[PDB]
């Protein structure tokens, strides 16, 4: 149960820019990353208000989750190297800090770094290359929009790979980024809008397949929506139950559920299409019967049969509906008969 | 006419927990 020290300083902006520079240099923070990102997030989102920050929801949720904080008052600080005493790889990291040139500085504040980080979120969990490409294209789109101009230093590959590695390895940053993106979405700032946009784009990253399969296992009808009768079949029952359980264990996570795979929450591991072959197959069958095809669902050769049946089933369901529809309208028995005859004719 | 809920809305509701799964998953 890791404890994250949070520091308190008179001048934040300096500490922040000096962190931004350290990340630009590409230092491998390990323990204190959390604290520095905490500072960035404080400065940008919570305006340095430590009370407001510590009272805000995110903190309470995270404390409730497990990673707890503690204040440390350090007013007299200019360089960064002095805020790191915790021995580990500190001399190595220090070498890397001392190695940095103090001369140059890039015009970029927390918000920009945090939005730039946010850019990674959506495709992050897919694959380094995909995520980077996504980031690039989204930057090109944001520059096309004229929503923001990022430093051409950052658009380097290595940098993006470092930040990517950081986002992949660290949780806090993502949790705060997304929390800002969704929960507290006030203010008139651009960075906030970019974050909110990226986070809105990230929703259900890594679950879309499962989600769609579910969409197909569901069924619309005059009496609202219902679970698709096929799925109620006997031989799938256990799979449906385990699925239900999994889906509950996900749902329990509330508003953060769509970001369950990014954050890697508790139950999320138990929801992959491969874990639910029969259901997947059925869903695909239904889809195929309706005409559309379902993405990212390779079906097992034993289940090919199942799917291939499910298609037929769904088609027969669909057909049957028609004659029940006719009934409802207003007509003569013979007219109904002829119409049904016409259904059977058009269908074959 | 009956068909699969392609809009996602409901899936989203269930996965969010805005609708309890059991409201759809009912064995009796």
Swiss-Prot record, chain A:
<comment type="similarity">
    <text>Belongs to the filoviruses nucleoprotein family.</text>
</comment>
<comment type="function">
    <text>Oligomerizes into helical capsid to encapsidate the viral genome, protecting it from nucleases and the cellular innate immune response. VP35 binds to and stabilizes monomeric NP, keeping it soluble. Upon virus replication, NP is recruited to bind cooperatively viral genomic RNA and VP35 is released. The encapsidated genomic RNA is termed the nucleocapsid and serves as template for transcription and replication. The nucleocapsid is helical with a pitch of 10.81 NP per turn and a diameter of about 22nm.</text>
</comment>
<comment type="subunit">
    <text>Homooligomer. Homomultimerizes to form the nucleocapsid. Binds to viral genomic RNA. Interacts with VP35 and VP30 to form the nucleocapsid. Interacts with host PPP2R5C; this interaction leads to VP30 dephosphorylation and viral transcription. Interacts with VP24; this interaction facilitates nucleocapsid assembly and genome packaging. Interacts with matrix protein VP40; this interaction allows recruitment of the nucleocapsid into progeny virions. Interacts with host STAU1.</text>
</comment>
<protein>
    <recommendedName>
        <fullName>Nucleoprotein</fullName>
    </recommendedName>
</protein>
<feature type="region of interest" description="NP core">
    <location>
        <begin position="1"/>
        <end position="348"/>
    </location>
</feature>
Swiss-Prot record, chain B:
<protein>
    <recommendedName>
        <fullName>Polymerase cofactor VP35</fullName>
    </recommendedName>
</protein>
<comment type="similarity">
    <text>Belongs to the filoviridae polymerase cofactor VP35 family.</text>
</comment>
<comment type="function">
    <text>Plays an essential role in viral RNA synthesis and also a role in suppressing innate immune signaling. Acts as a polymerase cofactor in the RNA polymerase transcription and replication complexes. Serves as nucleoprotein/NP monomer chaperone prior to the formation of the large oligomeric RNA-bound complexes. Regulates RNA synthesis by modulating NP-RNA interactions and interacting with DYNLL1. VP35-NP interaction controls the switch between RNA-bound NP and free NP and thus the switch between genome replication and genome packaging into the nucleocapsid.</text>
</comment>
<feature type="region of interest" description="NP binding region">
    <location>
        <begin position="14"/>
        <end position="28"/>
    </location>
</feature>
<feature type="region of interest" description="Disordered">
    <location>
        <begin position="14"/>
        <end position="28"/>
    </location>
</feature>
<comment type="subunit">
    <text>Homodimer. Homooligomer; via the coiled coil domain. Interacts with nucleoprotein NP and polymerase L; VP35 bridges L and NP and allows the formation of the polymerase complex. Also interacts with VP30; this interaction is regulated by VP30 phosphorylation. Interacts with host IKBKE and TBK1; the interactions lead to inhibition of cellular antiviral response by blocking necessary interactions of IKBKE and TBK1 with their substrate IRF3.</text>
</comment>
